Design a protein around this nucleic acid. Structure first.
Lengths: 227, 170, 137, 197, 188
RNA sequence: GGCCAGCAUCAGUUUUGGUGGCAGGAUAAAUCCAUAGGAAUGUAGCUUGCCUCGGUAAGUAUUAUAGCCUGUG
RNA sequence: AGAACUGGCGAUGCGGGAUGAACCGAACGUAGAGUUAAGGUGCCGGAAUACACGCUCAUCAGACACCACAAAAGGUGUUAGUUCAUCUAGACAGCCGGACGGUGGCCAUGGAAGUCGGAAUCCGCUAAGGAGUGUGUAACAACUCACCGGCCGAAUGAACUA
RNA sequence: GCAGUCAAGCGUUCAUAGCGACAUUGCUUUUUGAUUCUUCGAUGUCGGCUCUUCCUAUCAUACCGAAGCAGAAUUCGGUAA
RNA sequence: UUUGCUCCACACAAUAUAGAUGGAUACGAAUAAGGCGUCCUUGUGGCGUCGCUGAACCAUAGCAGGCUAGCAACGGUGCACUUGGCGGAAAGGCCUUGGGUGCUUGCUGGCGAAUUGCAAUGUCAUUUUGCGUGGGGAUAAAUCAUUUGUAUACGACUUAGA
């Protein structure tokens, strides 16, 4: 005995299994002879309306995402086994979180789009000092006369997880010394990014980068480097 | 005791209009000749309708080991009776010969499950030929290559009552 | 001066090719080689040069020696006897000081009483040359 | 074979030592047990204490004087376990407890003599490792034996006076064994090796 | 199930040196020296090469192997105590009465003296263990910092100091007074 | 020829050793010798890899510069 | 308390159950040697601190039929089994990332936006994302898991049986 | 207590030959704190003055734990004779 | 109260043995570790070795151990003195200096044993005391009676008296 007691729940959603893997094994091999362009895209951090923007903007494209080794299983990782030919070099490149794209419009439009397409997400850049008074949920962005004081439930979250010293006088939250969370030109810590997350500061821009292209009729591997 | 492996064959009764009953052999583990004949009628009654008085024994043979000094892995199927109802059991023993393995099975059942000699039935004893299908874990850990282990803290068994040495271990 | 002085704690360890001495049993004082380990307590030994038959044995009946030689696991009796003389452990055993201890109490037990009188007179003569050599330095 | 066997008491189990002593007394061997405060019991410390308090509350209800006598010293606690193993009410059991002396520490004249041990009573040979044991000296202080501070002080007096002896005996066996080596290779010693000495 | 041998590994960095006779462990490096006695645990240490040392238990049960992971965990804390060292910072939040905390030296013993806790007249002395140096935080209101080489000297001396200020026979949802440990961090 | 004893060769009962001759079984099974086929906890060779200049890692290779298993005689 | 067959004690010693009319051996003339029964072999106490494989740690262990007697079910103690699953093509553990749109779904109301509540509970896009398990703001925000994905590289989980 | 209901288990293999823990429903003198003034055959002898001791299943005092525990008071609960 | 009293030396008598018949032969600590030797930069170092039983080490020849002749050695051992220490846990022992003094089986010679009749423990150690010898040593108290009252049922206790 003396085993770990696992937490049992009652939620609605259930686990997928292997049968969702083998469908993505089939949908990748089906999309090769159907569409003409194979675009592999490295995109590590994503936001869901960013992804739901790219899906609905392009009807001719099919943006198929999944596990990496399933994509190696379906495209064929070794040169000996592959669905269509000259395909084992481009599947070597997908090392990060990658989702394949199957369009048929142009090779110039796709490579032009993602440099033109840019968004803004969390920083995960500019520095921020907190005033030594009542802290607000915007955090000195907008004028504090219109601001909202922070909810005191996340104040124990601030004293323990964010390491920021907050002692509380009355219904609002107070700090007594001015505190800066980041400095410019520095790689941000994960505790520094979560301060900017609770403050709602997504002031670092986001863009998706693409790494390679394949054409079925030409049957050759094309590598393009844009960030 | 020291177990021996025997072969007992049966020949129900040569009667009129049924001459030559077919034959019925078994492999019995026992400590001598007399128990193995009585253990043969114990199993053979359960299968079909004979008795000892309406039966007879053809022959007995001691089955010696085919390869004594070759170390074998064994997988033994055992059915036993608990204090509650009966249920099966599959255990695996690494040992030298066939009949020395069931020697250590009766020591193992009576120690771990408190099963006496009368409550244990031997289904089939077979040798595992190829490795890497040995299902148990306490058997596989002797199958890693170049196995070396020390024996720390050896005790000493002396003859006299007083030793003048303040005796040491290893 | 910037090293780790961690001790090693040297142990005789069972393995394939460890030569052993049989302290009790039928053979009782004959060298043999561990061929294959069976489990924690039982091993498969053989020494054909001394005369012990190839057999399983329990580790409580055997005592481990420091000497070793190389041998493939699961070797047969003819293959052991070739690798035995190739390491010449019959010569290497008597060179050890422990095998001289066994031969000494074996020789002391077989002494004729007239020879035991000769041990008497000779140990008188040796103690006289010592006690003059002592108490000068 | 010796007239008096002097048993060192450090590292032994209470029961297994008392068994092998209570047989040698009835067969006639004189025995003195020294350093009985360093003796050991199997079982952890908090058990043996509760196996002393249930002994400690047994007393003759109408007069506490006449009851079971609860000795507290470690020399006497071992003497309890030994007196239970000898038939002490007869005349043979009383003449076998005249053959026994038990002490804390090592008093004179027993420090100058050879001390022996009993291998089948040793703790390190008997209990499996990873198993709790209990020093009898620590038990007796926790039940009222107010002399631990004196015995441990008189050992540090003895251990210094013992080690100054041992440094002379060690240097004396250095001078003998080297003078034995020059007696080796002489033909009076070449014959002894043939005879086995 | 009588495991034949298990092992763990101790990662020795470049600064420190470790001297292990039978079960006596000494860790010497940049910040200082430490010792820890291990005669009870019955294991075997083996050096391979100057940065890695393998612990070992041969032929042990389940209890004897579970006590082999913790010997790795003790020597690794003896390593980070000498390379980096430990530093516990404590905040002592009061409701109404200003808590006066001082360091006093009676007879060369260097106690920690707490006064005026929840208006009490009682003086509490918390003794300071060997090798833990208490300093009061500069320019941060209401903070006391404990720091030393050993985990078990520092973490015990911070745990002692908050049990000495436990509020008795009152409701802890209302009365906020006490001393608490902010977070358990390193020096460097 | 009264009392208690010691040894010798025997008889009755009985305990405890040493050692010798034969019959059985699969005319013990094994080892051992021969000879076919085989396999990995894969030996030599080979190939790659990092690399203190040979050492391990992973690939090939069925006895060679170790051997083993199975079957038959 | 009252019946049936047999064996007992009553009339009955001896050896074993510490002690006992009924249980276990066994039935008695007086002595010697030898071998045993039931029961035993650490010491009292005559006899192996015998050999072998395991299991067990109790802050009231347990130790022998009749016999001096305890019952269910619980236990993140430990050991051995049973069928079902998941996996070296990446499982299980844990950090990290996403965890969405129609939507602040109908009514309820001083306010209820996934969560004071009744009835409900359907589709879109998805690798995956419930008209939504928990933290709680007067509502909201905010965090969490359930669901998938990134790293690391060997097995692991559930249900029971004794 | 009887009479149901629900069903993890049990019953040579077993749902439905038949048992049934854990729950729960049946009223047992009136849903608005009005009262019920109901003692219903103890067929049998111990009780009390003095005095000692022993259990724990703790009424007080020691120390903890948990609750709308603001204090004040007061409850539940544990170790302890 | 008849010359008692004590310690040392010796002779006879007694008196018993819980059981002499080569010798109780001195480190401490750890046991998943130590012992001894050797070096060294003195250390929780380096190297070498030993254990697996005290079956050891020491001692041991002579009429139960005799009377003598030598050789070789400066050693061994016993007894009485002496010199300087050390030990208080119940030390009551352990070393040590100077001579004296026997013995020597380290080596080699000569003499002696018988008759205890073929075995009978074939007596060989050690407790306690007594009676006389011969050299020293030293010259008391308690109780009852009488009397106190801090005491007291009687004993006891507490005080006094040349």
């Amino acid at each position: 005995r003396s085993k770990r007691s696992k937490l049992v729940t009652l939620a609605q959603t259930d686990k997928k299994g292997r049968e969702n893997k083998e469908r993505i094994f089939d949908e990748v091999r089906e999309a090769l002879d159907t569409y003409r362009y194979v675009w592999v895209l490295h995109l590590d951090d994503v936001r869901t309306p960013v992804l739901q923007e790219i899906r609905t903007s392009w009807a001719g494209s099919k943006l198929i995402m999944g596990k990496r080794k399933v994509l190696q299983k379906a495209l064929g990782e070794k040169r000996e086994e592959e669905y269509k030919e000259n395909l084992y070099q481009l599947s070597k490149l997908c090392s990060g979180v990658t989702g394949l794209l199957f369009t048929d419009e142009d090779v110039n439009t796709v490579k032009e789009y993602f440099k033109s397409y840019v968004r803004s997400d969390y920083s995960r850049p500019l520095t921020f000092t907190i005033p030594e008074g009542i802290v607000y949920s915007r955090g000195g962005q907008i004028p504090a006369e219109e601001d909202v004081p922070m909810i005191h439930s996340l104040e124990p979250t601030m004293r323990n997880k964010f390491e920021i010293p907050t002692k509380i006088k009355a219904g609002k939250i107070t700090i007594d010394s001015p505190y800066l969370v980041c400095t410019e030109g520095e790689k941000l810590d994960v505790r520094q990014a979560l301060i900017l997350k609770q403050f709602g500061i997504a002031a670092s821009e986001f863009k998706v980068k693409v790494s390679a292209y394949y054409d079925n009729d030409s049957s050759t591997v094309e590598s393009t480097n844009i960030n | 005791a020291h177990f021996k492996e025997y072969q007992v064959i049966g020949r129900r009764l040569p009667t009129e209009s049924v001459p030559e009953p077919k034959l019925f052999r078994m492999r019995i583990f026992a400590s001598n000749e007399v128990i193995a004949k009585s253990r043969y009628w114990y199993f053979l009654q359960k299968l079909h309708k004979v008795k000892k008085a309406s039966g007879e024994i053809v022959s007995i043979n001691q089955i010696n080991e085919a390869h004594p000094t070759k170390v074998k892995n064994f997988g033994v199927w055992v059915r036993y009776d608990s204090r509650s109802g009966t249920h099966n059991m599959y255990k695996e023993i690494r040992d030298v010969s066939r009949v020395a393995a069931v020697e250590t099975l009766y020591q193992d059942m009576a120690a771990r499950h408190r099963a006496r000699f009368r409550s244990i039935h031997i289904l089939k004893v077979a040798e595992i030929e190829k490795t890497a299908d040995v299902k148990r874990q306490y058997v596989k850990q002797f199958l890693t290559k170049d196995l070396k282990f020390p024996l720390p803290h050896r005790v000493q068994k002396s003859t006299k009552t007083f030793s003048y040495k303040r005796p040491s271990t290893f | 001066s910037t090293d780790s002085i961690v001790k090693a704690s040297n142990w005789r360890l069972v393995e394939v090719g460890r030569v052993v001495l049989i302290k009790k049993g039928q053979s009782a004082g004959k060298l043999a080689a561990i061929v294959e380990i069976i489990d924690q307590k039982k091993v498969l030994i053989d020494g054909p040069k001394a005369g012990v038959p190839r057999q399983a044995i329990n580790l409580g009946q055997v005592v481990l020696t420091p000497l070793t030689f190389a041998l493939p696991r699961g070797a047969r009796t003819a293959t052991v006897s070739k690798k035995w003389a190739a390491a010449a452990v019959c010569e290497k055993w008597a060179a050890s000081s422990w095998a001289k201890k066994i031969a000494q109490r074996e020789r002391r037990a077989a002494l004729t009483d007239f020879e035991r009188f000769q041990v008497m007179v000779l140990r008188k003569q040796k103690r006289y040359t010592v006690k003059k050599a002592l108490a000068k330095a | 074979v010796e007239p008096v066997v002097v048993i060192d008491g450090k590292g032994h189990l209470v029961g297994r030592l008392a068994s092998v002593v209570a047989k040698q007394l009835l067969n006639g061997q004189k025995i003195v047990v020294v350093r009985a405060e360093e003796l050991n019991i199997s079982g952890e410390f908090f058990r043996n204490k509760l196996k002393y308090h249930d002994f400690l509350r047994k007393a003759t209800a109408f007069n506490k004087t006449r009851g079971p006598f609860h000795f507290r010293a470690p020399s006497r606690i071992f003497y309890k376990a030994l007196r239970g193993m000898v038939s002490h009410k007869t005349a043979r059991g009383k003449a076998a407890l005249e053959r026994l002396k038990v002490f804390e520490g090592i008093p004179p004249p027993y420090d100058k003599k050879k001390r022996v041990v009993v291998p089948q009573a040793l703790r390190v040979l008997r209990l499996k490792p990873g198993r709790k044991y209990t020093t009898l000296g620590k038990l007796s202080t926790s039940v009222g034996w107010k002399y631990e501070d004196v015995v441990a002080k008189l050992e540090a007096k003895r251990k210094v006076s013992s080690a100054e002896y041992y440094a002379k005996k060690r240097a004396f066996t250095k001078k003998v064994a080297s003078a034995n080596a020059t007696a080796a290779e002489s033909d009076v010693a070449k014959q002894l090796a043939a005879l086995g000495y | 199930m009588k495991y034949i041998q298990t092992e763990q590994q101790i990662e020795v960095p470049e600064g420190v040196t470790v001297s292990i006779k039978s079960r006596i462990v000494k860790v010497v490096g940049p910040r200082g020296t430490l010792t820890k006695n291990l005669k009870h645990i019955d294991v075997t240490f083996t050096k391979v090469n100057n940065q890695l040392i393998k612990v070992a238990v041969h032929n042990g049960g389940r209890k004897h192997v579970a006590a082999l992971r913790t010997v790795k965990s003790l020597v690794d804390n003896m390593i980070t105590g000498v390379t980096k060292g430990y530093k516990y910072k404590m905040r002592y939040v009061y409701a109404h009465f200003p808590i006066n905390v001082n360091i006093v030296e009676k007879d060369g013993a260097k106690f920690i003296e707490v006064r005026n806790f929840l208006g009490d007249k009682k003086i509490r002395n918390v003794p300071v263990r060997d090798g833990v140096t208490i300093e009061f935080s500069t320019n941060v209101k209401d903070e006391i910092v404990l720091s030393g080489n050993s985990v078990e000297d520092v973490s015990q001396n911070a745990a002692d100091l908050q049990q000495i200020c436990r509020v008795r026979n009152k409701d802890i949802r209302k009365f906020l007074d006490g001393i608490y440990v902010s977070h358990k961090g390193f020096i460097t």
